[PDB]
């Protein structure tokens, strides 16, 4: 047992490792979206940069779980980072729809971890999730939803002019 | 009788209280429009902010009548602030049309109060309306009319691209 | 269903709308207290300004619930803002006593909403209340209680000199 | 006839001369109040300074009517400035009560001049009164009324401690 460990259930330690992996998975998916929008036959550079920045943020989310694990006396256990679900992302609307789903998947995992922490009577882990993750998730989901609404208003997927306008004025 | 009261008719005092209520009603209507345009399925944030700012201005208009009432020795009497006429505002054109009508309703009440003040030979109240309210109303009405003209030119309500363009370049 | 909605119970959405209304009600009550203390026959301007500022803060509390509702994918539903309980507020002690009661009423509604959020397993809503509302309420209640104690020490309601001194040195 | 004169009735010209005299009379009354509160056996120096400043403001009001008269092509006609009604002013409450009455007398004369200007269809004179005099009068009356309310709360005339406190914290 780690000399620092106190009130930290094995189940929570394991679930933190799984959550770390999911953050890394999300990072990698956003990196793929960046690369897609940077293609010469896609060429929506502000959209590409949005996804590149999102990829970096998800890596920071992962690193914060690594630090957390060690602060509590748990032990970081890494698994493979699975490649993203798609190799190509269609267009800005399809990518944003996939991003919304990804953010909701991550949010559900965070909510499930909060449930576990509650069950194991771990207020420090509850606070960490509430203070560092849950509101950031709600904000990200709202932003992407707002984007999807605008992409639909702009006539995506068919309206290429609309797609151009979005990249030039929304991101 | 208030020790400060001079040349202030009871009818004018009552009409100032009614006008205060109408300013608060206008504020509340604009708050509703703000909340509508901030919805994830509407997502026109510059339009939302325009209405939020308008809501704050109407509250200032109300507060200025409260201060006026007390300066003249009248007594502020508050009534319920009725909820807005609609719960949802359709789109930018419908909302701007409702805002135009609201501003004209407020303007008519101000003009009617000026008529009353004239009838009761109250030049201080006439001056207050002319110096603090009537020109602001004319300016607001003109601005909203100009917006409606542009929204129609942009093909509202059907043209979603036009609606997007308005939010990005007119507000 | 809103595309952003996740883990947000209908009961919580409705209770947020009711809480929004109560914040607006509190704002309006403080506006009435402002207007009372600004009367020429009351004339306690620092007290009036305290209540005017409190009125503005309550409006901000309401606006933050509107924003919250939309972030979660709920839909803002407005109701009439009821006029305050009194048209005149007696004196500084009576007004502060009413303010204490109002703040405790608002606090109880916030605590009840936290209970509901807990029952529905909504940690984001719990965090929002804890981080943005509950401590502000405790602070406001303590401040007003401290004022009441001082007003009683100063001999309110009978001691007009005491009332004058409070306005000049406590606010 | 003056080469500049246009739409300026003889009655209005005469009434402007009478109004000028009344402003000078008000100045002189406030000078007397200054001198009273500066007496070694009265010794309320902040009150004295309030009245001295008011005396200077009334002289400015008079000078503005002189300038107005000449701008319209009327001819300034001066009369004696009558000495104030009292040689001694009792105490701060009595003086403020006399000041309130004086300001209301001046206000009534301004309102009567506005009536005359209206009757003679002189919008320039109406504007001058509304823009330069009537609101200043309402503000001054409100300020003095507020002071009287506070002096009564402080137990004037009997409560010398209250009178001291007013001079140290209200002016
Ligand atoms: Cl442990
Ligand atoms: Cl424990
Ligand atoms: Cl364990
Ligand atoms: Cl593990
Ligand atoms: Cl894993
Ligand atoms: Cl694996
Ligand atoms: Cl693919
Ligand atoms: Cl997903
Ligand atoms: Cl879990
Ligand atoms: Cl967060
Ligand atoms: Cl936000
Ligand atoms: Cl289209
Ligand atoms: Cl009157
Ligand atoms: Cl009159
Ligand atoms: Cl009347
Ligand atoms: Cl009324
Ligand atoms: Cl009303
Ligand atoms: Cl009503
Ligand atoms: Cl509706
Ligand atoms: Cl209307
Ligand atoms: Cl009217
Ligand atoms: Cl104006
Ligand atoms: Cl203009
Ligand atoms: Cl069109
Ligand atoms: Cl849900
Ligand atoms: Cl859940
Ligand atoms: Cl539900
Ligand atoms: Cl509801
Ligand atoms: Cl309600
Ligand atoms: Cl209701
Ligand atoms: Cl009452
Ligand atoms: Cl209450
Ligand atoms: Cl509740
Ligand atoms: Cl708080
Ligand atoms: Cl504190
Ligand atoms: Cl006492
Ligand atoms: Cl002439
Ligand atoms: Cl003419
Ligand atoms: Cl003539
Ligand atoms: Cl003359
Ligand atoms: Cl004369
Ligand atoms: Cl004479
Ligand atoms: Cl005398
Ligand atoms: Cl007089
Ligand atoms: Cl006259
Ligand atoms: Cl003025
Ligand atoms: Cl003022
Ligand atoms: Cl006393
Ligand atoms: Fe993340
Ligand atoms: Fe994310
Ligand atoms: Fe207004
Ligand atoms: Fe308006
Ligand atoms: Fe509040
Ligand atoms: Fe409050
Ligand atoms: Fe004057
Ligand atoms: Fe004066
Ligand atoms: Mg060891
Ligand atoms: Mg273990
Ligand atoms: Mg996993
Ligand atoms: Mg594989
Ligand atoms: Mg917390
Ligand atoms: Mg937070
Ligand atoms: Mg946004
Ligand atoms: Mg009275
Ligand atoms: Mg009446
Ligand atoms: Mg009405
Ligand atoms: Mg109704
Ligand atoms: Mg103007
Ligand atoms: Mg313009
Ligand atoms: Mg939908
Ligand atoms: Mg529902
Ligand atoms: Mg309620
Ligand atoms: Mg009622
Ligand atoms: Mg908790
Ligand atoms: Mg806090
Ligand atoms: Mg304190
Ligand atoms: Mg000549
Ligand atoms: Mg003549
Ligand atoms: Mg005279
Ligand atoms: Mg004489
Ligand atoms: Mg006029
Ligand atoms: Mg003016
Ligand atoms: Mg004042």
Question: DSSP of D72-127, one letter per residue?
Answer: HT--------PPPS-S---SHHHHHHHHHHHHHHHHHHHHHHHHHHHHTT-HHHHH
Phi first, then psi: give them for residue B81, nearest 5 degrees: -90, 110
| Rounded Cα distance, C41 and B5, in Å | 11
Strand partners, B81: C81
| Rounded Cα distance, B130 and B119, in Å | 16
Contact between B123 and D134 using a beta-carbon 8 Å cutoff: yes
Q: Which residues of A touch B41 (CB under 8 A)?
A: 145, 149
Q: Is the peptide bond before B8 cis (omega within 30 degrees of 0)?
A: no
Least CB–CB distance from A134: residue in C73, C121, C124: C124
Q: Give me B151's structure tokens.
A: 């929204």
Answer whether A109's CB lies under 8 Å from A11's CB. Answer: no
Q: Is the peptide bond before B105 cis (omega within 30 degrees of 0)?
A: no
Answer whether D153's CB lies under 8 Å from C160's CB. Answer: yes
Query: What's the maximum distance between 2 C-alpha atoms anywhere in chain C?
Result: 61
- B141 CB burial (10 A radius; 0-12, 13-18, 19+): middle
Answer positive or negative: Cα dihedral of D122, D123, D125, D126: positive
Ligand nearest the Cα of residue B85 is: 19
Strand partners, C81: B81
Residue C109's alpha-carbon distances to B122, C57, C99, D36, in angstroms, are 47, 17, 15, 58
- Name all contacts of A77-86 with Cβ < 8 Å and 24+ positions apart: A77/A14, A77/A17, A78/A17, A78/A20, A78/A21, A79/A17, A79/A21, A81/A21, A81/A24, A81/A25, A81/A28, A82/A25, A82/A28, A83/A28, A83/A32, A84/A28, A84/A29, A84/A32, A85/A29, A86/A32
The string over A101-127, giving b where at least 16 C-beta atoms fall within 10 Å of a residue's C-beta and e elsewhere, is ebbbebbebbbebbebbeebebeebbe
Answer whether C89's CB lies under 8 Å from C100's CB. Answer: no
Computed over its alpha carbons, how large is the radius of gyration of chain C? 18
Q: How far is CA D167 from the centre of its chain?
A: 21
CATH of B1-171, one of 2.30.42.10, 3.40.190.10, 3.40.50.2300, 1.20.1260.10: 1.20.1260.10
Q: Which residues of D touch C36 (CB under 8 A)?
A: none
The neighbour count for residue D46, using CB atoms within 10 Å, is 14
| Rounded Cα distance, A116 and D86, in Å | 86
Least CB–CB distance from D114: residue in B70, B73, B123: B123
Residue keyed to tokens 């009435």? C32
Answer positive or negative: Cα dihedral of C18, C19, C21, C25: positive
Answer whether B86's CB lies under 8 Å from B98's CB. Answer: yes
The neighbour count for residue B155, using CB atoms within 10 Å, is 14
Residue of B nearest to A139 (CA): B40
Residue C74's alpha-carbon distances to B53, B54, D6, in angstroms, are 23, 24, 67
Residue keyed to tokens 């409560």? D159
Is the pair C, D in contact (3+ CB pairs within 8 Å)? yes
The string over C120-148, giving b where at least 16 C-beta atoms fall within 10 Å of a residue's C-beta and e elsewhere, is bebbbbbbbbeeebbeebeebbeebeebb
Answer whether D118's CB lies under 8 Å from B119's CB. Answer: no
Answer whether A76's CB lies under 8 Å from A66's CB. Answer: yes
Q: What angle do CA C67, C72, C78 make, to 5 degrees?
A: 50
Answer whether C89's CB lies under 8 Å from C32's CB. Answer: yes
Q: How far is CA C163 from the centre of its chain?
A: 24
B: neighbours with 3+ CB pairs under 8 Å? A, C, D
Task: Enumerate chain D positions whose Cβ falls within 8 A of a Cβ in C.
Answer: 142, 145-147, 149-150, 152-155, 159, 161-162, 165, 169-170
Can you give the residue ranges of every domain in chain D? 1-171
Residue B82 CA, ligand 67 centroid: distance in Å: 6
Q: Is the peptide bond before A93 cis (omega within 30 degrees of 0)?
A: no
Residue A50 CA, ligand 63 centroid: distance in Å: 14
Alpha helices in B3-91 (DSSP H): 10-37, 45-72
Nearest Cα neighbor of C87 from C33, C165, C149, C128 is: C33
| Rounded Cα distance, B140 and D127, in Å | 25
The neighbour count for residue D6, using CB atoms within 10 Å, is 10
- Using DSSP, state whether C81 is helix, strand or coil: strand
Nearest Cα neighbor of D76 from D67, D85, D84 is: D67
Instruction: Report how many Cβ contacts below 8 Å link chain A to chain C.
Output: 39
Least CB–CB distance from D142: residue in B4, B123, B128: B4
Answer whether B16's CB lies under 8 Å from B113's CB. Answer: yes
| Rounded Cα distance, D150 and B74, in Å | 19
Nearest Cα neighbor of A27 from A1, A46, A51, A2 is: A51
Contacts of B139 (CB under 8 A, 6+ apart): none
Q: Which residues of A touch B165 (CB under 8 A)?
A: 165
Contact between B123 and D135 using a beta-carbon 8 Å cutoff: no
The neighbour count for residue C36, using CB atoms within 10 Å, is 25
Residue C78 CA, ligand 30 centroid: distance in Å: 9
| Rounded Cα distance, D171 and D168, in Å | 7
Nearest Cα neighbor of A101 from C161, D124, C4 is: C4
Contact between D145 and C45 using a beta-carbon 8 Å cutoff: no
- D151 CB burial (10 A radius; 0-12, 13-18, 19+): buried
What counts of helices (H) and strands (E) characterise chain A?
6, 0
| Rounded Cα distance, A4 and D151, in Å | 68
Contact between A134 and C126 using a beta-carbon 8 Å cutoff: no
Q: What angle do CA A16, A21, A26 make, to 5 degrees?
A: 125
Residue D101 CA, ligand 81 centroid: distance in Å: 27
DSSP at A84? P
Contacts of B17 (CB under 8 A, 6+ apart): B69, B74, B76, B77, B78, B79
The torsion of the CA quartet A104, A110, A112, A114, rounded to 10 degrees, works out to -140
């Amino acid at each position: 047992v780690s000399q620092v460990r106190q009130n930290y259930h094995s189940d929570c330690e394991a679930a933190v490792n799984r959550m770390l992996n999911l953050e890394l998975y999300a990072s990698y998916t956003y990196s793929s979206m960046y690369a897609f929008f940077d293609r010469d036959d896609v060429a929506l550079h502000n959209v590409a940069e949005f996804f590149k920045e999102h990829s970096h943020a998800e890596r920071e989310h992962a690193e914060k779980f690594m630090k957390y694990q060690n602060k509590r006396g748990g032990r970081v256990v890494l698994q493979d980072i699975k490649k993203p679900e798609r190799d190509e992302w269609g267009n800005t609307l399809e990518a944003m729809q996939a991003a919304l789903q990804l953010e909701k998947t991550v949010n559900q995992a965070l909510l499930d971890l909060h449930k576990l922490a509650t069950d194991k009577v771990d207020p420090h882990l509850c606070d960490f999730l509430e203070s560092e993750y849950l509101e950031a998730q709600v904000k990200a989901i709202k932003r992407i939803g707002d984007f999807i609404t605008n992409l639909k208003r702009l006539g995506l997927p068919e309206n290429g002019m609309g797609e151009y306008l979005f990249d030039k004025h929304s991101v």
